[PDB]
Amino acid sequence: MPFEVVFDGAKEFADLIATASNLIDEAAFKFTEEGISMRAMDPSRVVLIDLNLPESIFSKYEVEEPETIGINMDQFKKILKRGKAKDTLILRKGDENFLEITFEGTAKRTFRLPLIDVEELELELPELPFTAKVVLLGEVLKEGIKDASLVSDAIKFIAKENEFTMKAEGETNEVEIRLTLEDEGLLDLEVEEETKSAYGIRYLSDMVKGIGKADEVILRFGNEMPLQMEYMIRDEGRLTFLLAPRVEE
Amino acid sequence: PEMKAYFESLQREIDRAYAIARKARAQGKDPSFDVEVPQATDMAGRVESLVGPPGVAERIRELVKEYGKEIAALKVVDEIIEGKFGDLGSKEKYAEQAVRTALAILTEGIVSAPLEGIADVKIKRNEWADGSEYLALYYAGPIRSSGGTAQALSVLVGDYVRRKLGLDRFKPSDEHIERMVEEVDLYHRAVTRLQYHPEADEVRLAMRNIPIEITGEETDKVEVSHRNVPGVETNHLRGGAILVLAEGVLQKAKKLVKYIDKMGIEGWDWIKEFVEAKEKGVEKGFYYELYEKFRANIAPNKKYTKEIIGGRPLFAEPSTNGGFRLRYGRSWSVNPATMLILGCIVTPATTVEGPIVRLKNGSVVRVDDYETALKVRNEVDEILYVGDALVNFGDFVENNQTLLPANYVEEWWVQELVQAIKDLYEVELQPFAENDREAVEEAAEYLEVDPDFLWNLLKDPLRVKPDVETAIHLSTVLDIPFHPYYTLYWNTLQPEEVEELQKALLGAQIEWAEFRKNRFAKKVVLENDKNIKRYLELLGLPHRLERVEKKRKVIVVEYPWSAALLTPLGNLEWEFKAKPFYTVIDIINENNRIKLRDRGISWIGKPPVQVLFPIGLAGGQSRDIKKAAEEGKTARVEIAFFKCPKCGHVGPEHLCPVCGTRKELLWHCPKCGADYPESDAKDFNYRCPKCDVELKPYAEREIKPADLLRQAMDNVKVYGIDRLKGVKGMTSGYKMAEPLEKGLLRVKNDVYVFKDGTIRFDATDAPITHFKPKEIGTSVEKLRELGYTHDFEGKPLERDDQILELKVQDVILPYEAGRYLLKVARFIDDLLEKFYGLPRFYNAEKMEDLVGHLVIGLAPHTSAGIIGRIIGFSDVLVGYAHPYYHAAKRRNCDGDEDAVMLLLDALLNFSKYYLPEKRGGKMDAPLVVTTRLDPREVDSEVHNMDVVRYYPLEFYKATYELKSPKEVKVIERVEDGDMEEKVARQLALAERIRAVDEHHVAETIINSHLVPDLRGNLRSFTRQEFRCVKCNTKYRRPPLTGKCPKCGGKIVLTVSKGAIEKYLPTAKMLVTKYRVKDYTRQRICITEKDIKTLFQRTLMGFSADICEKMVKERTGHS
């Protein structure tokens, strides 16, 4: 159960805590020898969060016995709120059920917080082909979602062979975001067949609020298949989100 | 003479307060000339407080003391009926004064039934049945706060009344009985859920057996089917008839036979048969037999049923008896270390020990004081041991209550010690006190112990307790059982876990030590992988967990817990075996050198009023008087005015603002339109010569506060006022106005007032026995200045940490009453300095300066208030009382909270003219004060001295025969929340979830709150109340109208869709956090109903959705 891990930087992980806190409210990061992971769903049934952080992201990584602890998103979010990326993030847990967050930067800040007993049911995710996998940047997703969410609440995703488009309609205000490979915002296209689906942009707003500007974002979804969006962290970590499609109009 | 001299000092202080009350009252600024409230010497003065008669106090003192109140009451009834107090009139008056007076004598003036309970007493005739006369009792509104016993006893009095007058028994007809049964059912189904629901046969027969009839006016606006019933005046629901009928007699049937059998009245065999109808219910260890007797008892199973229906159903462990540890005391005490962590009154105390607590890291440590709980409170997982509690022997529990066996305490063990050395080494040692140096010296010589340790042991056995080696050394010689402190609860689980446990201990690393031939282990090193340590956790054994040695769980039991652990096993010499009808301790004591005793075999457990000024709706929305006087709003209400004969001023003021002469009352004739001063009204005997009607003091007219409020600010010369509000209507009989200057000082003194004109602060107290100055924080010099001279040991009061007894007129109020009543004292001082012109009497500037003054305590449905004296302050919001200050008779009427007021405040602000005429709360008015409470200086003053931890052996040895708490002979043989409570439910419920081992069973605790949400959402759902913006009290019809025809505002509807959506995730997250059946339909039906009403296909059921997961189970199984 006692373990210690030292990760360099505080702001890069604070973006993950920010995205998670804005997409989930109660989660318990499970700690394995391969790294820190978390497979949970928002308690309002809006998104599905799957955090995969290997030990390669962490500078120091010391485990005695793998176990699972619960971390509040709010409190831990407020800790790394003003935490500078030039600090040294230190996670330490000993015999007692306390969490020690030592910062070795301009001022050593050894922290301590209790760890509640979360009863999170470890649920997995099945595998099936989506036939629509796109590789796009993050900033294009930012400006593409924040502008269309004001004119409508649902956005339609359509991907064809070497063609990508995201059109959303409404009462008297239409919009579309069409990108191809020869553009400057779409990296890669792995679309094999015609794909079209509808989703809620209101989930996509807070879902993309924590994304970066140069982070490669990969989306996987289908026609009647759910929405999947995963992106890497420091080229090794992977964060995957899956939300159910909209069965309404 | 000490308590007598203190009573003399109290009498001098009351004489001074009466002198100031007369010098200030003589001014005429109050509706009284002299002091209206008298003092009572004893119960005789308190009986006359209700109805009198004025002069029966001598007969009470001469007959109650001699013959007893049962016979003296009948003697007084005989004196009233025979006409010894004066000619009253018809038989209804003599019968009324006899019932009210006799009721005041039997109840000792504790209840207010002759005042607010019984409306009238009328003799009627049974013309519809035979034509004979009978007695009819008319009850008023407030009847529930009077207790069910006395309500029955009154009827018995009627049985005597008709016996002395010559009336006849009442004959209920069929329509009367069926109507009363209908009133019980309707009153029981909707108004108030009673405890015992009566049956038609016993109401019919029992009602037929009742001699006189009882009824009342309309109490609850509940229409009945049986209308226009002969002999019944109203066609509504009478709450008094049901509470006196059902809850009065049927509830107290097991005591009413004792009253009837005690007085000597014949004709009550039906209640006796009713009591009799309630009686239709080699290889064997001794401890096992005692448990069989404990299970065979009906009292713990029935009370366990009442607590299991009156709370959480099927959540507590059936094996471990939850509740406090049964600690008897002499006629509650709870460690406050567990109050804030997690029925009866929870009395706080810091003298007893605390329970043990399991930490979060795996260790288990005990919490004896409140400081440890503040330290380990952040790692508490569950609360195995609740705590301790003192249960008085004279605990009034009727309906065949048995006395459960007493726990094996450390005091009876001291008694076992002094009798062991007394029977073996003939050493005379008196326990529960300090002995001479000779007896303790030789006892220390034979027992090889420390005399000082024996002094502190005999001094305080709970504080000072021996270690394990002295206990083993003293058990194998005196043939005495082991020490109770180091005695585990071995009778808590099957012996298989013990049989496997000793085998798990055979392989453990156990080291032994030898001290005075005592072979006792020092530590045990054992792993949890071989056997679970759940039984060890149930034993309450402090241990430590360690997993840093690459091992799973290596727990170690160190000294002195190791020796105390291997002591019952006989140091692993004899092998324990699971035997039928033999418990663990029985088999241990079967073959062992040290005996054992089962310790735990028992477990138990607004209104914002500032002035009596009727403003009505003229104050706007908050009835602000300042806004009405400022704007100019008039109040067309019923009020009275006064008249000044000399000057000519007319106003609600008592004293003439212009002149210096006192004005009198004004009487307006209701029929005519003339006003008659008080002087002219009393001349015509308050009768108008023209109209033959009664001159009413008040009348409906207009009120202009702009010209009234201004005439009062210049009197006391005040200008800083914030906001003042009055009442909607005067509930008193005369409806007399209150001087506004009092409110002008209340708005600046930050105090509030009630309808009775007294500033009564509601508080909660508790009876105590003894305490120390350290717990209250009082110096020795202060206690010496209070009047304390010596303790119960006769030693002078010099030691600070010394047990001191409490006197009669002593109260310890919290900080809230100190600052508030301090502000009230400043209101009286400010009231005396400018409004009365008299010097200040309190002269209190700080909270501690209030010590020494006198207070008055008034209880609900009481006409007398016991004068007290503040002696200290407590941090807890509740106060402390004394059994003499707060008697045991007044506690049985379900009265816990009391109203606290000041002496001079009531002496200068209370007026009898403010009595209500039809309505009334739990208490009416402080009509009589009581100060003389001499506690039998010749008789009981000595009995009170020896009460400090008087635990005899006859109780502990005689308790194994399943006695009753009512059998006082065993003692006489030796005597001769939505914020705190909601979180408390969220934590205790989780503790119950941890207690049931993830095995949840359907229950109704939160569902008790979910049903009103279901019927409220479905009920208000089809209502759709339309309320426009401008008009609020103008509701629109449920059909749609488009817009409000009266006002040009949109109509707002209340379908209850957005207000209830806040309480749903509260329990929805808890219900969603577990898969249980029979409740999923209620949880998902309402939210799916909201979905269907308002109108995201979820990929899968990961939010704990039992819908897809469950149906998938059934479908895949088919």
Ligand SMILES: [Zn+2]
């Ligand atoms: Zn005058």
Ligand SMILES: [Zn+2]
């Ligand atoms: Zn008249």
Ligand SMILES: [Zn+2]
């Ligand atoms: Zn309107």
